[PDB]
Design a protein around this nucleic acid. Structure first.
Ligand SMILES: [Mg+2]
Ligand SMILES: [Mg+2]
Ligand SMILES: [Mg+2]
Ligand SMILES: [Mg+2]
Ligand SMILES: [Mg+2]
Ligand SMILES: [Mg+2]
Ligand SMILES: [Mg+2]
Ligand SMILES: [Mg+2]
Ligand SMILES: [Mg+2]
Ligand SMILES: [Mg+2]
Ligand SMILES: [Mg+2]
Ligand SMILES: [Mg+2]
Ligand SMILES: [Mg+2]
Ligand SMILES: [Mg+2]
Ligand SMILES: [Mg+2]
Ligand SMILES: [Mg+2]
Ligand SMILES: [Mg+2]
Ligand SMILES: [Mg+2]
Ligand SMILES: [Mg+2]
Lengths: 150, 129, 123, 82, 80, 205
RNA sequence: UAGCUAGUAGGUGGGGUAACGGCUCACCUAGGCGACGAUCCCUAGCUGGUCUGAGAGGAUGACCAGCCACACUGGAACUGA
RNA sequence: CCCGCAGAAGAAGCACCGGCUAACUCCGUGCCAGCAGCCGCGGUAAUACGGAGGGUGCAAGCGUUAAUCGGAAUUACUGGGCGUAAAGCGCACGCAGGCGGUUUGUUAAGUCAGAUGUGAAAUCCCCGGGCUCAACCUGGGAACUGCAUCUGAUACUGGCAA
């Protein structure tokens, strides 16, 4: 149950006396399938080098989120830089419909039946990220009682 | 200019909280009270207190659980500019159940959980989770 | 912003100009050939693009593109025109339906024959 | 005069009438006062094919209404009671 | 009775040609906010008595004049 | 309507057996499956997600011999019908007579099993149903018409029908050449090598 | 487009209509409408609904049904329930 | 609708294959001829022009044009913005309008509740039934999220009083 996938790979340029020196960037997401999901970025002069240098970053940099069986408990909003993301429980019929790119984090995460959309910029590095913090801020479908009950 | 007292509460809380502040005061009113109630009752603050006669003065004790505060989000919903009224079948339910929505009905200031039970509707004062 | 504001002056939806006054939403319109030109294109490109100005059945006198390779089309030719700009010829916003009215189809075309109105050559 | 008659909402070569109370002058399949039955002339032996709310009908009839040659025929065919 | 409205006078100054205001409050069908939607009515009062600024009760009758379909029923308060 | 072209070509591009030459031989070869659906068939298609999403539904489709029109509508239907879109898709897709015909072994290939339908040589609960997409349902009973019964094809058909895994939700005879659709094939029946929720994603955006 | 309005707004009486009614008339009052948009200009048959959209909305009003209006153009009445 | 008869016999085409986007090679051409929904292809190895072989997608249709909504949270009520990107009137005063601290009483218009009537049928949706299936036809519900009358409730808003 390793379960990983990269979301976006891209090229960038540096520009020096001698010209444009190019490179690449991968942005990836790994999840166990039962909460616990992390993304990693990492860049390198060639593609494989970067996509791998990324996968690792994600293995560290890994949060965990209080599911509720196949789904989220309540609806949640996330918002990093220019991405404002929104995802919703959805009493699954099938579910897992969402903006492929946050479909990534969502499936490795283990949620099985949500609807999502991304507003603002669909800049990957900030959606996958906005959603992570999204799922992250989410809270204990019970241990709000922790907060309260008292 | 102090044209919405309830937002001034919702916010004196909200801020004081984010400022890990224990206490919090303000001018009181029947309406302020009835809400402090639901906030205590439903357990988002320790307990309230009104000290004075001429110029009454609501006082609230903030709860903090872990490092965090207990009130993750306090937001007005109705307001002077644009008032809200849901019936019974159209009363909102915050955070899918978790947390709650204050609402004033003809039979006093209750929660959504309550007003649904009470079978009636009112003005949805604010949301709290 | 304010609810008063929106109440006073509601939100209005930008109405869309067309890009093809083929008058009233028409699939295509008939016209007669005022001039049969061939002008050259814009910045990056360079060529001798065949076109024609057409008085349309509905008055409008517009320039349209003549697609394909080669064409017998001259002054007084009765043609049919459809929507379709040609970014290269700024101000050309319509295409001529090859193979319509008095417009020939492109000669010897075997690929994509239905555009460039060419009939299925005898197998 | 108001009349009970067969409005015809079938389908080419597979007719299916809606029996209806209405203003006699209105269009066959047009403005009516109430529906009071239906008559499937294809129905077939299977089951249903002529449900007919006898209680309203013969209340209108008394109320003043009149009946089609081909409606009264459905009634002394439905029998009435059994 | 069969229904009735109230509202302040607004104009007495004409021979039984009494005209009454009727403010309401209504949700704006689009932006929620509640706003005042007034209604003026030409109501009949015989022997002219309802006075400018008098709140008054009103019922809907047959057409008296072209314009008039309402008569008063009672008065309520004066000297505003 | 029907595909009609070179059958194996399909499997080769789809990358798996589809049983369109279903007959005699097995585990292809005697064909060339895989390494050249065309002139550049060898080359590896590092294909996009859209690519894989497309080819799954394309695969399921080349399987039952169904065109885009009908297929899209099966999907539509599935989605409507309560409970998991992706499964119902398959349910519907199996409820096809022509399929139930081939499944009960009355035809070598799904096609043949279809030509059989088209040729009023099949009968649900008694009467002839010559239309391939006729939806078969629990307790239904399909039988070859005496007229052309035990004729060339169908013999061998019912023959290597046992060579196959042999279904479960149904019950062949091979004497009376009739068979009874016992129950709507469960998910767990069939498949493994078909991944619905892709062809769901495909038709979901 | 910021003002509009003399049967105009109301009253009294005669007339009138199948009927209430400035419907009409005579006389009296000076009223009536309007920034919650009158007047003027532009466009338009309205609806059930239709297409779209997760929704809220947007767009639309063939085919079917309901209402209205028109019948070569303007005007009129006669017959008749 | 049923039965016999003959022979696979009478019955496949259209768009695409540079990226977005499923599908690649050769030959011609050489900023020409031409392509182009958008980016942009064409000056000698063009998967982007034209032909070919191959492939992908559709299929009695296939493409092109036109047209509405969608994606467009790009008029943002739901659901947006105004220091430097579009966007705070040069400044003030103030009528209308909007909004308005706090307490009690009353009012009950807003608001809330219930009841009742109404919201034509068709349509849409749910479960059925009928045409070989289907489209189609059809029984019955559900839904018409609305409106109106009456009776209630009085926290909040509005009125009134102090
Ligand atoms: Mg970092
Ligand atoms: Mg207050
Ligand atoms: Mg077809
Ligand atoms: Mg008179
Ligand atoms: Mg008109
Ligand atoms: Mg949307
Ligand atoms: Mg007609
Ligand atoms: Mg006339
Ligand atoms: Mg007469
Ligand atoms: Mg590709
Ligand atoms: Mg082309
Ligand atoms: Mg070359
Ligand atoms: Mg929008
Ligand atoms: Mg903006
Ligand atoms: Mg600026
Ligand atoms: Mg300034
Ligand atoms: Mg209805
Ligand atoms: Mg059936
Ligand atoms: Mg009060």
């Amino acid at each position: 149950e390793l379960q990983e996938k990269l979301i976006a790979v891209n090229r960038v340029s540096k520009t020096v006396k001698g010209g444009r020196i190019f490179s690449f960037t991968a942005l990836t997401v790994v999840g166990d399938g039962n909460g616990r999901v992390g993304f990693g970025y990492g860049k390198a002069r060639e593609v494989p080098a970067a996509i791998q240098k990324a996968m690792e970053k994600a293995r560290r940099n890994m949060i965990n989120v209080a599911l509720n069986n196949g789904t989220l408990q309540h609806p949640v909003k996330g918002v990093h830089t220019g991405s404002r993301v929104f995802m919703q429980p959805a009493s699954e019929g099938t579910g897992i419909i969402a903006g492929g790119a946050m479909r990534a984090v969502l499936e490795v995460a283990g949620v099985h039946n949500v609807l999502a959309k991304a507003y603002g910029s669909t800049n990957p590095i900030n959606v996958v990220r906005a959603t992570i913090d999204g799922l992250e801020n989410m809270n204990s479908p019970e241990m709000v009682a922790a907060k309260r009950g008292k | 200019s102090m044209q919405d007292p309830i937002a001034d509460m919702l916010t004196r809380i909200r801020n004081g909280q984010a400022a890990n502040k224990a206490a919090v005061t303000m001018p009181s009113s029947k309406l302020k009270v009835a809400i402090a109630n639901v906030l205590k009752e439903e357990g988002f603050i320790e307990d309230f207190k009104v000290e004075g006669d001429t110029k009454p003065e609501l006082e609230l004790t903030l709860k903090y659980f872990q490092g965090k505060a207990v009130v993750e989000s306090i937001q007005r919903v109705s307001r002077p500019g644009l008032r809200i009224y849901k019936r019974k079948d159209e009363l909102p339910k915050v955070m899918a159940g978790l947390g709650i929505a204050v609402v004033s009905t003809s039979k006093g200031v209750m929660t959504d959980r309550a007003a649904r039970q009470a079978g009636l509707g009112g003005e949805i004062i604010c949301y709290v989770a | 912003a304010t609810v008063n504001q929106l109440v006073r002056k509601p939100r209005a939806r930008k109405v869309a100009k067309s890009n093809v006054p083929a008058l009233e939403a028409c699939p295509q319109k008939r016209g007669v050939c005022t001039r049969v030109y061939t002008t050259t294109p814009k910045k990056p490109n360079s060529a001798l693009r065949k076109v024609c100005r057409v008085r349309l059945t509905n008055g409008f006198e517009v320039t349209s593109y003549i697609g394909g390779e080669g064409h017998n089309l001259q002054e007084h030719s009765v043609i049919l025109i459809r929507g379709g700009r040609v970014k290269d010829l700024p101000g050309v916003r319509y295409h001529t339906v090859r193979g319509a009215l008095d417009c020939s189809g492109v000669k010897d075309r075997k690929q994509a024959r239905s555009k460039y109105g060419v009939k299925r050559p005898k197998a | 005069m108001v009349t009970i008659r067969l409005a015809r909402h079938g389908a080419k070569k597979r007719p299916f009438y809606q029996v209806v109370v209405a203003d006699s002058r209105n269009a066959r399949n047009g403005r009516f006062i109430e529906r009071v039955g239906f008559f499937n002339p294809i129905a077939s032996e299977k089951e249903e094919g002529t449900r007919l709310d006898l209680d309203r009908i013969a209340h209108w009839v008394g109320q003043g209404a009149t009946i089609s040659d081909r409606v009264a025929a459905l009634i002394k065919e439905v029998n009435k009671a059994a | 009775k069969i229904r009735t409205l109230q509202g302040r006078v607004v104009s007495d100054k004409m021979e039984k040609s009494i005209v009454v205001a009727i403010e309401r409050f209504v949700k704006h069908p689009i932006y929620g906010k509640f706003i005042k939607r007034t209604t003026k009515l030409h109501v009949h009062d015989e022997n002219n008595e309802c006075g400018i600024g008098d709140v008054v009760e009103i019922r809907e009758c047959r057409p008296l004049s072209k314009t008039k379909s309402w008569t008063l029923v009672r008065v309520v308060e004066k000297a505003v | 309507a029907r595909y009609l072209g070179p059958k194996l070509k399909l499997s080769r591009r789809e990358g798996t057996d589809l049983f369109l030459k279903s007959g005699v031989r097995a585990i292809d070869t005697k064909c060339k499956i895989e390494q050249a659906p065309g002139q550049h068939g060898a080359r590896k298609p590092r294909l996009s997600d859209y690519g894989v999403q497309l080819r799954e539904k394309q695969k399921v489709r080349r399987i039952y011999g169904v065109l885009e029109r009908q297929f899209r509508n099966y999907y539509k239907e599935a989605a409507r019908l309560k409970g998991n879109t992706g499964e119902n898709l398959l349910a519907l897709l199996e409820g096809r007579l022509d399929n139930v015909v081939y499944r009960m072994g009355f035809g070598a290939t799904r096609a043949e099993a279809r030509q059989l339908v088209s040729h009023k040589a099949i009968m649900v609960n008694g009467r002839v149903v010559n239309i391939a997409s006729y939806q078969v349902s629990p307790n239904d009973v399909v039988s070859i018409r005496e007229k052309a019964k035990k004729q060339s094809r169908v013999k061998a058909a019912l023959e290597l029908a046992e060579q196959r895994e042999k279904p479960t939700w149904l019950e062949v005879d091979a004497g009376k050449m009739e068979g009874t659709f016992k129950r709507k094939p469960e998910r767990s029946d069939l498949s493994a090598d078909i991944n619905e929720h892709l062809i769901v994603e495909l038709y979901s955006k």
